[PDB]
Design a protein around this nucleic acid. Structure first.
Ligand SMILES: Nc1ncnc2c1ncn2[C@H]1CC[C@@H](COP(=O)(O)OP(=O)(O)OP(=O)(O)O)O1
Ligand SMILES: [Mg+2]
Length: 598
DNA sequence: TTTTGGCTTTGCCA
């Protein structure tokens, strides 16, 4: 009983369609687009299709317009008024870039619901959903175009009807899992915030990147000249096999030539040191500067180059990642003798007259573990301002806690997180530099010093065995069917994944809730500012996320007002038995952030 | 096959 009604055919018909559209609590939306590239509301975007149920879809044609566009803008922007769209980020971005309509209100997406049902599953397309969840609409799939031809109006109407049908079985599957309130309050606003982040982009100064690239090229020239001096012949260094032959075959001994093995050989003859330096710098050149120099787009209104990341937001533990040129993977500051500090994060500058504001959670997963495990000792350590990764390193090495190097603190952090996430005695011995027996004794002392952590690990494994899944703080469930396998290795891996999911998913939920709260409070504080840089410079813009940090671009007169809001919201996102401490750093660029005491 | 998450196996960010 599939029917299409062209409401944009009569003035009275359009008026009445608007009248009973504004009164609907839930509706599904789809867009019709032609074959174009980056949009127009009369050339690329053909129109919209709206469905309320019963296989009846209403199609609005934006072709040959101001009156109908205004009515559609009034209906879509704060009409319940829940709008259900497939790929909410794509739909939001397309609407904003084509007709300047921002989806204000409650949004829903069957992709997010399907991910909530099983985070470890594969990202299924809309027809793949119809075959599984709602197979009664299988005949309607004939009409969602093909590989060659597709009618935008018919495809849009069919997509709207299918999406409405799917988010009527998905909303019932999510109610029995108690994830419905979580879906409508945390995940969907997080998707809207990620869409705003993608629209904003992050500034990127080519002038700084050019200087950095010149420095790395000069360093490669110097390193190749030095290495050829040690060998006397001109051999290629990018091929691992080239190092494998001749080099380290008779000169040295352990061919699995990686970073870890040659690090132990670094105190010896400095040939491995040169190779490690060359490999690090070459990897940086290949994977950071070159990919980032081609994906930049010149924003004319801001008169600057920006990078627009693409959020992935379909992960096992709820962590939010990006696509191919991942800005989150940019290496931090390192040193080159040449000394020169290669700050690759210094190339990400804000607009003309702003500062980068990054707020970071202090030991977020440690505090989540303290709250979950009710461990008194670690909880009382994380309420007095003493750095856990510094005191642990001081006790392990014997030095004073205030005289601990940053490199030593990172090692203590790695050791602590590994032992929490089930790192074996052999791995701890190989990493911390002691024998296996001493590493096992250290693990035993760690578990007998924090009585709550061991009990939490055991109880989490037992509950994963009992229920077959692990539930985070907000209620997100990850299914691990390998927790009852007869294979010891797979069972241990499932146990480690259970603990890691239980902690990391809770941390990610806290981060997402903090992001949503910050966006709401910023909108409340600055109601006359653009939502993003593609809408029309008061407030902040949320240009990046580092799975624990929230980087914002804000003006000179708004730095303090935005920092206070961000810190307060990060602290008050959730109430736990531990204190959520977040530190705010403001600077002229991402790589030049200085702590902002406040 | 014995910290894990993301991207690409090994190294960089979480
Ligand atoms: N090796 C590891 N294994 C497991 N989880 C890890 C990890 N390294 C980091 N994480 C997780 C845990 C936390 C999350 C943030 O990563 P940060 O390195 O920034 O740790 P943070 O506690 O914030 O250290 P601080 O900022 O006080 O120096 O990444
Ligand atoms: Mg942190």
């Amino acid at each position: 009983t599939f029917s299409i009604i062209d409401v944009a055919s009569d003035r009275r018909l359009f008026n009445t369609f608007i009248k009973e559209w504004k009164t609907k609590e839930r509706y599904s939306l789809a867009l019709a687009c032609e074959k174009r590239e980056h949009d127009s509301d009369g050339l690329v975007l053909i129109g919209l299709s709206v469905c309320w149920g019963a296989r009846d879809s209403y199609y609005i044609s934006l072709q040959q317009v101001s009156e109908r566009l205004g009515q559609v803008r009034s209906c879509l922007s704060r009409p319940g008024g829940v709008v259900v769209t497939y790929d909410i980020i794509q739909v939001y971005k397309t609407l904003v870039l084509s007709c300047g309509i921002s989806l204000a209100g409650n949004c829903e997406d069957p992709k997010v619901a399907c991910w909530l049902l099983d985070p470890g599953s594969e990202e299924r397309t809309l027809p793949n959903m119809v075959t599984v969840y709602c197979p009664e609409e299988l005949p309607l799939l004939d009409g969602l175009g093909s590989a060659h031809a597709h009618c935008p109006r018919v495809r849009a109407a069919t997509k709207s009807v299918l999406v409405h049908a799917v988010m009527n079985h998905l909303t019932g599957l999510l109610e029995k899992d108690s994830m419905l309130d979580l879906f409508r309050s945390i995940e969907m606003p997080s998707q809207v915030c990620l869409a705003l982040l993608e629209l904003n982009g992050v500034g990127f100064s080519v002038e700084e990147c050019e200087r950095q690239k010149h420095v790395m090229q000069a360093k490669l020239t110097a390193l190749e000249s030095q290495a050829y001096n040690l060998a006397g012949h001109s051999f290629s260094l990018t091929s691992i096999d080239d190092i494998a032959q001749v080099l380290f075959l008779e000169l040295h001994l352990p061919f699995s030539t990686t970073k870890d093995i040659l690090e132990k050989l670094r105190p010896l003859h400095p040939l491995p040191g040169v190779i490690l330096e060359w490999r690090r710098i070459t990897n940086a050149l290949t994977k950071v500067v070159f990919p980032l120099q081609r994906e930049k787009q010149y924003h004319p209104t801001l008169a600057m180059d920006r990078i627009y990341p693409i959020a992935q937001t379909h992960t096992a533990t709820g962590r939010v990642s990006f696509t191919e040129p991942n800005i989150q993977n940019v290496p931090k500051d390192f040193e080159i003798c040449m000394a020169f500090s290669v700050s690759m994060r210094h190339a990400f500058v804000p607009f003309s007259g702003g500062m980068i504001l990054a707020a970071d959670y202090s030991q977020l997963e440690l505090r989540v573990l303290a709250h979950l495990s009710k461990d008194q000792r670690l909880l009382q350590v994380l309420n007095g301002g003493a750095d856990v990764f510094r005191c642990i390193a001081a006790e392990w090495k014997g030095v004073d806690p205030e005289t601990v190097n940053d490199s030593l603190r990172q090692q203590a952090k790695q050791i602590c997180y590994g032992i929490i996430y089930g790192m074996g005695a052999k791995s701890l011995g190989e990493q911390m530099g002691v024998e296996e027996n001493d590493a096992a004794c250290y693990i035993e002392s760690f578990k007998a010093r924090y009585k709550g952590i061991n009990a939490f690990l055991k109880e989490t494994v037992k509950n994963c065995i009992k229920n077959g899944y692990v539930q985070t703080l907000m209620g997100r469930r990850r299914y691990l069917p390998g927790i009852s396998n007869t294979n010891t290795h797979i069972k241990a891996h499932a146990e480690r994944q259970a603990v890691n999911t239980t902690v990391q998913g809770s941390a990610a939920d806290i981060v997402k809730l903090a992001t949503v709260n910050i966006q709401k409070r910023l909108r409340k504080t600055y109601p006359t500012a653009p939502l993003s840089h593609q809408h029309t410079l008061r407030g902040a813009f949320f240009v990046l996320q580092l799975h624990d940090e929230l980087i914002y671009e804000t003006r000179e007169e708004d730095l303090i007002q935005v920092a206070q809001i961000v810190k307060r919201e990060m602290e008050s996102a959730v109430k736990l038995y531990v204190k959520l401490k977040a530190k705010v750093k403001v600077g002229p660029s991402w790589g030049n952030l200085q702590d902002l005491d406040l």
